[model samples]
Target: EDCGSDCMPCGGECCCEPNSCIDGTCHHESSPN
Candidate 1:
């Protein structure tokens, strides 16, 4: 549901904890409910 707006361009997942950017790409720590 929230993947496109939440994760795109650089590509990433959300929640579970920390979110950061590296080499122009987004990264998520883990997956949450």
Candidate 2:
């Protein structure tokens, strides 16, 4: 369960996308609660 390029599998290391793994990078900043 991993990935590459811009990166992925964040918390496990590599990261990317609408990034959210904050300190590192990769998710969303949404809120509706």
Candidate 3:
């Protein structure tokens, strides 16, 4: 998640236990079933 070269559309797949970013995008934390 380094939006310093092009900006926007950083990446994906970030949620299996710990991974977050609540300001510049990139957050997927919800799964335990």
lDDT of 1 by residue, 1-33 (tens): 444434434434332225554456665566768
What are the models' TM-scores? 0.29, 0.23, 0.20
**Which candidate comes out best when scored by lDDT?**
2
lDDT of 3 by residue, 1-33 (tens): 543333334344332224455454566567789
Order the candidate numbers by TM-score, best to worst. Answer: 1, 2, 3
Which residues of candidate 3, in runs, are more than 4 Å off?
1-19
Q: Model 3 — TM-score against the truth?
A: 0.20
For candidate 2, list the clashing residue pairs, or say none: 19-26, 19-27, 20-26, 20-27
lDDT of each: 0.47, 0.59, 0.45
List pairs with backbone clashes in candidate 1. Answer: none
**Reference-based TM-score, model 2:** 0.23
Worst 10 contiguous positions by lDDT, candidate 3: 8-17
Steric clash pairs (candidate 3): none
Top candidate, metric TM-score: 1
User: Candidate 2, residues 1-33: lDDT per residue as tens digits?
Assistant: 447765566566765544546665455556569
| Model 2, backbone clash pairs (residues 3+ apart or across chains), number | 4
